[PDB]
Structure formats: C-alpha cells, structure tokens
Design a binder for this molecule. Structure first.
Ligand code: ADP
Ligand code: ADP
Ligand code: BEF
Ligand code: BEF
Ligand code: MG
Ligand code: MG
Lengths: 645, 645
C-alpha cells in the first residue's frame, strides 16, 4: 500500500526556529487512503508527517520534490489526489527517495552558507540544536536515548535562517545513547535530480579498456547466467561466473555444453572439473576457499545473483572487488534480476494466482487444491526445513511424488525429469532452473538480526518475517524459465529490497575466521570494498565494531571449531568460542540445545553458571558476566555505532 | 476499536491432537473492521484468531460463549454481522471476557477427565505438551523463550480427549524463559456465567454488624465524596475519607461546612486541621505517614477514588484492607465512578465536542479556538508539567488569565473565583471540583513500565501513551459537576481500564522504605491485602520478587536519601541507593542528569565505570557489573516471574 500524509510540522517564519504539529487524519483514513492510494486532502507546508501501515516518519520538500528515507519508505508510492504517486527518485545508496511534491506543498530552500549551527526538527515538533561536523554529520549538544529520535527520519536539519541543510537518516550512538546524527545532505538531492531516472542495465556491459565495475539487470530466465558468459567467451574472453547456488552451478555444468557449445570448468564442494574451457562457474564459497582471485586468470568476473546477501556472497563479492583489478581482470559484472530498490513487476511468462481458503492442503493460512500439483512439475517454498519435511510427507501420503530439499541435503535428491513436487527452502530460491510448471510461495522467510541488548553484549536473533521484493521475484522466477509458468501465493505484499542487517557482517568475520583463514583486518578490507561499491545491497557500516570484536577472540579451541564447522550450523566461530571459554572454566554452555553439542562429552564435569559472551539462542543456565572476554566485548561496544531512526 | 476475527485454528476430532490455521483477513478488514465494528464474515470452528489494530491473540468457544483474556481484549466489543457485539461477560479479576458465540461457531466440551497431561494450542497452530500442576498452573515439558508464547493468550489447553481445561493467559518465566503456563480454568468460565449480569453498587452500603468491604460506584459529581460521608455522619458514624488528591482534600473543608454543616478534620502533607468533627478527609499519603489505621478511631473508612493506581493509593488502600477490622472499623467502602472494566459512557451534564484543526492555539496535533476559552473557567489537561508551562505562557500570551497547576505547585495558584484557564497534569484529574465550564483533554498520559531487561537487571521506563478509560472519564468529570459542562477532546479512543504495571509495585516498596518506615516484608503484607481483594484494579503478582530486591538494599546513605526525597523525583530510594553504591565505590553515577544531582558535590572525586544496579534512565557512563549488589539483584531475577501473553 501507499505511504500516506497524516499530518505536518509547521515551521516558524520569523526569529528563533520553533515548530508545532498538525494531525490531519486518524488511523481509519490512513489505511483506507493507503489502499486507494487516493488522498483528496489539501497538502500544506514543507514538512509532512507520513505513515505506512506499520511505521511513521517525516518527509521534507526541497526543490519541488518531497524527500524521505529509503529505509522508511522503500519504493512505495505516495497517496495522491489522482491516486498513487510513484517515486521520481529512488537512491538506495544515499538512503534517499523522492516524490514530486503534491500541489499545496511548499519547498524549503537549500542552505548555502556553511553555517555549522544546525537545528533538527523531530516528529514531535521539537527543535534540537546540532553542531555540524562534516558533510553529513553533526553532533548533538545534549545526548538522548535513540528511542527519542525514532520516527524523525526524513525530518529537516535547518540553518539558523530556516534553510535546509539535509534530512535526518540515522543516529550515532554509544550503548543506546545518541550523540550525533547522520543526514542526507541537500547536495545529494541536487545530484540525484540531475541524474537519469531510468537506468536500463539490461544489456551485457561492454568490455572496457581499463578496469570497470558494471551492472547487469534483466528479468529471471533471460540468460544472465548462461547466454551472457557464453557470448563473452565466444568473443575471446576468459570468464569466471560466481553464483551463490550449488544446485544452479551444477546445473550450468550439465546445461552449457548442449545449450551454448561450451563445456565449462566447474568449482564446488561436491564437484570440481577442469575442462580448460574459457568459462568457469564457481560458488562464492569455493571461490573463497581457493583463495580468491588468481593473477591473470580471467578477463571478466561475473558476480552473479548479486542480490544474495548471505554472508558467503557478501564476502565473496567484496573479495572480487578488492582483488579483481590487481589480478588483471578488465571487467567485473554485478548481475541480478532484482537490484536494490526494485519491486516485483509482471513477468511475461508468469501468470499469478492467489491461493484462497479452498483446497485440500493447508498452506500458511491458505490452502492448496490438490489438482494444482497433481500432475506436472512444481516447486513449493516453505520458510523452514521442518515445514518442508512435513509438507513433503503429507503430499507423499496423498500419492503425490514429493521431495524435500534444503541446506545439507544433496542436489541429487531432486529428480531432473518426470512429475514431482519439490518442497524447498530458499536453498532453491536463486539461480536454479528445475523445469517447474509452477511455484507456490509461502511469502515468508527466516532472517537474522543483531540486537545490541547489553545483556551483557549483543544478541543474534532469528525470526520469520514477510518476504522482501528480492525473495518474491526470485522465488517466482523459479518458474516461467523459457516457457509459460504459474505463480501461486499466500499473501500479495512485499518488504522493500536491497538492505541487509549488521548480523551478516558479524557472519562474515565469523566465516573469515572459521573457514577462510582471514584475519579480522583482512575481512574488513574485503567488506570495505563491498560497502564502497555503489548499486549493491546496503547495510549499516559496523565494520570497525565487528573487527574489534573478533580481533579479541583469540585462542579458540581448534577441536570445538572443527566440530562446529562440521555440524554446519550458524556462527561456527562464535559458538566454538563460547564453548571454548566454557570448557576452560568447567562451566556449562548457555543451554543444552543442539547448538552446544560439541560440549556434550564434558557435561558431567561442567558446573555453575555460564560465562556468557553474547546471546546466540535462549539461555537457560545461570550466567556470570565478568569473564575477561565478556568485558572486552563490552568495551568494544563503547565505539560509535550508527543505527537508523 | 472492536476485536476482529482474522482467522481460526482448526483442531482434529480424533486421535492425537493436531491443529492448523486458516486466515480470513489481512489488515484489509482487520484494522478497518476493528474501527467500523462490522464483520459479515461467517464464523466457523472453536478456536478464533482475533485481533485489534495493535495486537493479535486467540479466543476459545466454550459453552456457547467466545472467551478470551481481559488483558488483550479489555471491554472491547467483537465485530459482528450487524455491528459491534457487546461483551456478555467481563471478569477483570479472572482476566476473562466473553461474547455470545457468533452463529457458525462450535464450542469445546469442558474437561472432567481429571487428566494431568494437557496440550496447549498456540497461535501458530502448534500443539505443545503441558503437565497440570495446579488448578490454573501447568509446566511445559520443554521450556521455550517467552516470545514464542506471545500472541497465544486466549488459546485452549486441552486434555487428551480434546476437551477444554481452560484458556492460556500468562507464562511463568526464569530470565525470559517460560517453564510453566498460567491459565483460566473452565470452572472460572462456569462461575462467571452463573454470576449476576449486573450488580447495582450505586447506593451507600449499610453498616454491617461484623466487618465488611463494600463497593460504591456512581457517576462523577454524584456526591460520593461529600453527600455520602455527610449522610453516614448524620447516622452517628465516625467516617474517614481517603482521597488521592491534595487539591480535592483541601477543598472538602470549606465546602462541607457550607453545604453540609460539617467542619471536617483535614489531613494533608501541606496542611492539617483538627476540629474534632466525626468526619475526616485525608490524602492516602498523609494516612500512610500517620501510621495507618488508629485503633477504634473510625466506624467507616472510605477508600475514595479507588480507581487510582498511583503507588500511594495502592499502598494506602492495601493498608486499610489489612488493618481496618483490627482497628475496629465495621465498614470499608471502595468508591469510584470508574471501576475496573468500565468504559466511558455519556454523562448527563456533559456535552462532548471533538477539537478540529481550526483554531489559533495548537494543541496535541489539533487546535483550540480562542473563543472557547476566552473567557469563563476552563481546565486543560496536558501530559507534562513542561507542556503545562508552555501552554500557560502561550495563553498569556493572548491575554488569557492562565496558570499551570501540577505537583510541586501550591494549590493556592488556582483562583477559586473568576475567569481562568488552568493548565494541569493529572494532579487535577480525580476528586477535584473547580467550577469549570469546560475541560479540554489532550487524551494522553505518562506511564512507567518495568522491563526485565537483564542488562544487568531491570529497567524502569517512562513513556507517553493514549489515555485509558479511567483517565478519560475522570478528566472529563472535572466539568459537569452540579451543572452543565463541555468536554473537548483531541481523539475519540480509550485504552482498557483496571490494570496497572509491576513498576507500581516497585514504587510501593520504594515509598515504604523511603517515606513510611515500612520494611519490605511490611509492605508485602499490605500489598497482599490489596491483591486479594476482588473488584480492584489488577496487577501481575510480583510481590515476592520486589520484596526480595528491596530486602537486599541495606545501609543506604541517609543524607542521599534525604536529598532524593526532598527533590521529589520518581524512585527516591532506588536513586539514593545507586548513589550510595557509587559514592562508596568512588565511581560516577550513570549520568550527570538531574536525577543524580545529589552526587554533584563529589563529582571531582568520582572516576571509572558506574557500578550499575538497574536502569532508571539513560546511562551515559561506561558501566561495570562487578558490584555485589548488582549480583544480588541478578540473583533475585532468577525467581519465577509470571508475565502475560
Ligand atoms: N539447467 C538448465 N536446464 C534447462 N534449461 C536451462 C538450464 N539453465 C538455463 N536454462 C534455460 O536458459 C534460460 C536462461 O537461464 P539463466 O541464464 O539461468 O537465466 P537468468 O540467469 O537470466 O535467470 C532459462 O530461461 C532456461 O530457459
Ligand atoms: N469544593 C467544592 N466546591 C463547590 N461545589 C462542590 C465542591 N465539592 C463538591 N461540590 C458539589 O457537590 C457535588 C458532588 O461532589 P462530589 O461529592 O465531589 O462528587 P463525586 O465524589 O461523586 O465525584 C458536585 O457535583 C458539586 O455540585
Ligand atoms: F535471474 Be535468473 F533467475 F538468475
Ligand atoms: F466521581 Be467524583 F468526580 F469523585
Ligand atoms: Mg541467473
Ligand atoms: Mg469524589
């Protein structure tokens, strides 16, 4: 649904800068209006209070455009008189979007006077003094809990003259206490306005004279992973294609000989072939395992499915971007059907049909009619492996040839031909072509988030949430590949695309330490290359923080670590490190969940409270919070952390 | 906003117990439908998934009634085919409400099996084993984080036959890990159904032969605080009237003299009058300061405005309930216009007009027209003193005679005669008659909430929230007293009444130690009497926990405590105790905010991290968690804590 103006902040004209709020619609009008996308209300002033169904924040008009933050508004339309107003500008790199100001809105005039005394207008219509520190930073004169600033994203920072310097996007905190603010400067709005609104990256980049990074954006099934590298090779170039998917990589190996007359090298855990062809497909993981870029090996490196924000992909792409030019590559291509800021749009091959409550098979609050999957080939996405197992069993019991597939199973369990219903997690979301007549989508997924909970340190949490627009379009894209297909779904919405959580950064340091022999400093170099590259998914810059954390986790127990690596569960390094600290203290793990099995053999010798370093799951045992490592991580958390408001 | 049926949990009819969900609406309807009260959807099943605009939980049909928890639904109507359906049952004491089961719904059979293996059905249609421990208690077979049980209140506990043993209401936790469940047994549903539809409490209870506690409920301005005690006195009884309000208590003296020919004793912190009359008006605070009930002093003790859930009232009423019989009182009267579960109904004397955006004075997102308050006598409620000061300054200003009244100002600031606009906090919400032609209500208020945040211990947090139904009716009732009046408001809504937070219990122990020379054990006895008395506001039973915490806080610095008491801020005992710990540790306080001003004299000598005991506001300083008191309080949090789901 649409973002909706629900009120305004009225700014003083004369003298000291003051503000007050006017509210213009309640909840009922908000929702109704969010749907029709038709808002008949007269808009006034320059600072609007805007609301989605779930969140509320600000928007500031400058130069005839109503500006706000991407992290708040996504790519959403703004409700307007004639109906929904699509964003004119969507700049994910700058966390900035804009709609053409509706009639009645007035614009603030840009501040061009280099005044460093600033005033931030909050959603509560407070005006708080801020000292400008940099192009996009200013310190607060009196610090405040972040909770106070929450909902003031999009609000103006003003000069003493009432001219706008930029809009508020983020707080810089010390353990939950905001001490500085980060803003999108008015000049970024200016740059945006004199740049193309349309960027059709649908053609393969030309191979440049000197090193360049370029983007390739075209719909699922169009040929990005197959036709494009084959055409580069046919022109005499050596090409490495990196994909996050084992299943897809193996698929290219079987497909490319007959499809494009090229029998590529293949590099994965279960299958490494050297044919000597000028095309190589590898996973990001295997690429990392082999040590990254080899000097002079490739002309073109394709970072394929670069919408993937699993830690292996992030670290893999950062490695390419840090090493490619030195390694003699002429071109890095960042290829994806669903770039940051994209929304799901109609696919020419794909008919979409909502599930209803009618059907024999209960599916995420709706139902699947048995006749929809009785014959033919179908892929059904479930959010968890457990649901996959359960659904597969149910269907099998109904005489349907069903097979579950997810992380830790072998690709071979999927039959390549004949009738089948594959019930999968996002292990099959990206890259893969399984010849499916249809996809059925639960529209939910699992995600991890870090919370700086100070209890004593941080928490990594797992929750199931609505899918974003990358997931919806990629899951949908598993059908309609070279032919017609069907997409059935439970719910119609999607979260905005192109953002990922700080926990993934934590995951990258972990993997660098556990699997790829990278010092934390080495990982930072690779991740910094990723973050410095425009057009990729974005994340809060917590590199210094995470580096400091892992840098202090020295002398892990090699035995426990090999075990956590072997069992293949999340944060093998953080888990083995907590276990290490436990063992050396003869103390029990936080709980006796499966997470802590590397410790089971010591169970009768472990007593008293757990020296808790951080929280990776439920903690059932008593804890003590004064282990030297705990104190070190607490100290790490004293550094500035930028968090969104 | 009505409660809305958004789906159902379908249960199996034979064999092992299984469940699955069907979803019948999104925010389409839900938020819409809750705001319109109309739901044409046909109801099926015995377990409904229900929702308000803000929260989602369950309802279970038993004996033709759709039951759920008061803490989730309040007194809300259920959206129905022909409009909102009024609750048939409202049992705040048991946390239980019910609507007549809509057509199409089936009921579960009450369980008589006497089985101790139960199964709890969650909102995600999970079915989880529970061993019955008591009448309303059961242990989980495997503990889960409490977050998992959230949104499942109102859900059924089933015995193996699928018959209902009761509905889920709260989790018993150990550091956030649920290990048992508290439920409302079907027999309570049985008792609730057999209890009178309506009990009339509008007439003064007769004085019984043996001690009795009785209720008196009647509209604002009906005479509960004046006519009633005057009538009892005419019958020859000695009557103590305890009222929360300093302002109202002082007002009774002159008025009772002129209207009722009684010159009452008056007891407040700021002023005492002893006339020897058979009627005494006292604040709850002065009553506690006086040592509570004096042997054989009164026949009748009226706990007036017993809707009040400030800590002083709760401790005051608890003291009465524990002491009155032994002190030789024959009757205790719990009097209020707004008992737990009540909602605001129209008042014969009061015309209600919503504020619009039209007017010269900005007010909480709306506007006040100058002509509505110029002139005559008017009372405007703001949520904070700062807002009262700002608005009073603005009104005068425009040449309006305005004064702010809040705690810390002398009652004499309010002119008893002539034009005035009094801008007040809830210092003037209950009891008071100020001869106002109107009340203008911001409809918000300030509340405190405890969070068991384990960082390292607990947090007391202050937030601004929508007013409850007690606040609406009580604030409104400041006008229309013996004559017509006008109530102007910012927003239509009201939160449910009759519940208060655990932090109030914390405040009670704090006040006991700080002001009334009560040991924590002493305070527990008084609070236990409050909690055991039906018909009063309800709270989670955290008495043992809080008592354990304060019992450990020994050897407070007398001078610090004297200072925090004198400054009048929120938790003088806890603040002075943290200050004591800091000064002895030669360490700085959590911040240099005004809360910690008692330490300023020592500032130059204090360095290093704060030995943090708990969180009462922002913590700016680095912290250490090594202090023995910190560890004592951590150990206290290991106790069972029941929290709602
Ligand atoms: N393993 C495979 N088996 C059969 N057909 C395939 C396979 N891989 C690709 N194709 C065909 O090649 C087309 C292009 O696929 P691909 O290059 O993977 O698309 P993109 O990367 O653009 O999503 C697909 O639509 C499908 O028609
Ligand atoms: N201090 C006062 N000054 C003037 N009139 C008063 C005062 N107190 C009470 N009254 C009158 O007595 C009536 C009953 O007041 P009160 O007993 O305070 O009502 P209740 O306690 O039921 O709200 C009021 O409506 C008003 O007419
Ligand atoms: F865009 Be394709 F599905 F990789
Ligand atoms: F009910 Be009255 F206003 F005390
Ligand atoms: Mg591809
Ligand atoms: Mg009264």
């Amino acid at each position: 649904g649409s973002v909706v103006i629900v009120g305004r902040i009225i700014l003083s004209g004369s003298g000291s800068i003051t503000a007050y709020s006017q509210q213009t619609r309640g909840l009922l009008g908000c929702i109704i209006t969010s749907l029709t996308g038709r808002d008949k209300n007269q808009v006034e002033g320059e600072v609007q209070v805007v609301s989605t169904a779930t969140q509320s924040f600000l928007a500031t008009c400058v130069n005839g455009v109503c500006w706000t933050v991407y992290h708040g508004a996504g790519s959403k339309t703004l409700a307007g008189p004639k109906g929904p107003i699509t964003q004119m500008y969507t700049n994910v790199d700058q966390d900035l979007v804009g709609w053409q100001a509706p009639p009645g809105a007035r614009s603030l005039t840009p501040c061009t006077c280099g005044s460093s005394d600033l005033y931030l207008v909050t959603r509560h219509a407070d005006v708080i003094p801020v000292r400008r520190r940099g192009d996009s930073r200013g310190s607060l004169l009196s610090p405040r809990p972040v909770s106070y600033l929450k909902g003031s994203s999009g609000g103006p920072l003003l000069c003493p003259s009432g001219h706008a310097v930029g809009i508020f996007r983020a707080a810089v905190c010390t353990r939950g206490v905001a001490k500085a603010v980060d803003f999108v400067p008015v000049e970024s709005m200016e740059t945006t306005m004199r740049s193309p609104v349309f960027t059709d990256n649908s053609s393969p980049p030309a191979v440049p004279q000197s090193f360049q990074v370029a983007h390739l954006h075209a719909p699922t099934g169009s040929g990005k992973s197959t036709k494009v590298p084959a055409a580069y090779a046919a022109q005499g170039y050596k090409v490495l294609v990196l994909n996050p998917s084992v299943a897809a990589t193996l698929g290219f190996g079987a497909y490319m000989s007959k499809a494009h007359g090229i029998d590529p090298n293949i590099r994965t855990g279960v299958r490494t072939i050297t044919t000597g062809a000028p095309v190589t497909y590898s996973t990001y993981g295997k690429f990392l395992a082999d040590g990254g870029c080899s000097g002079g090996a490739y002309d073109i490196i394709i970072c394929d499915e670069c919408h993937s924000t699993d830690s292996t992909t992030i670290l893999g792409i950062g490695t390419v971007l840090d090493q490619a030019e030195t390694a003699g590559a002429r071109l890095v291509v960042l290829a994806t059907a669903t770039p940051p800021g994209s929304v799901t749009v109609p696919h020419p091959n794909i008919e979409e049909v909502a599930l209803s409550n009618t059907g024999e098979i209960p599916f995420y609050g709706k139902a699947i009619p048995i006749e929809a999957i009785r014959g033919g080939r179908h892929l059904i996405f479930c959010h968890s492996k457990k649901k996959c197992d359960e659904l597969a069993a149910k269907l099998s019991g109904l005489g349907i040839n069903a097979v579950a597939y997810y992380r830790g199973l072998d690709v071979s369990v999927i039959p390549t031909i004949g009738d089948v219903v594959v019930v999968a997690t996002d292990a099959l979301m990206t890259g893969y072509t399984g010849d499916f007549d249809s996809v059925i989508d639960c529209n939910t997924c699992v995600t991890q988030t870090v919370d700086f909970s100070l209890d004593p340190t941080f928490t990594i949490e797992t929750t199931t949430v609505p899918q974003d627009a990358v997931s919806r379009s990629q899951r949908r894209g598993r059908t309609g590949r070279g032919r017609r297909g069907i997409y059935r779904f439970v719910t119609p919405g999607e979260r905005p695309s192109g953002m990922f959580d700080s926990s993934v950064l934590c995951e990258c340091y972990d993997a660098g330490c556990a699997w790829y022999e990278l010092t934390p400093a080495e990982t930072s170099v690779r991740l910094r290359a990723y973050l410095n590259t425009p057009g990729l998914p974005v994340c809060q810059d917590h590199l210094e923080f995470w580096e400091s954390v892992f840098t202090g986790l020295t002398h892990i127990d090699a035995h426990f670590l090999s075990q956590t690596k072997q069992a293949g569960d999340n944060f093998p390094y953080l888990v083995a490190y907590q276990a290490t600290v436990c063992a050396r203290a003869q103390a029990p793990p936080p709980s006796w969940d499966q997470m802590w099995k590397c410790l089971i053999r010591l169970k009768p010798t472990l007593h008293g409270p757990t020296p808790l370093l951080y929280r990776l799951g439920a903690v059932q045992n008593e804890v003590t919070l004064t282990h030297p490592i705990t104190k070190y991580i607490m100290a790490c958390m004293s550094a500035d952390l930028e968090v969104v408001t």
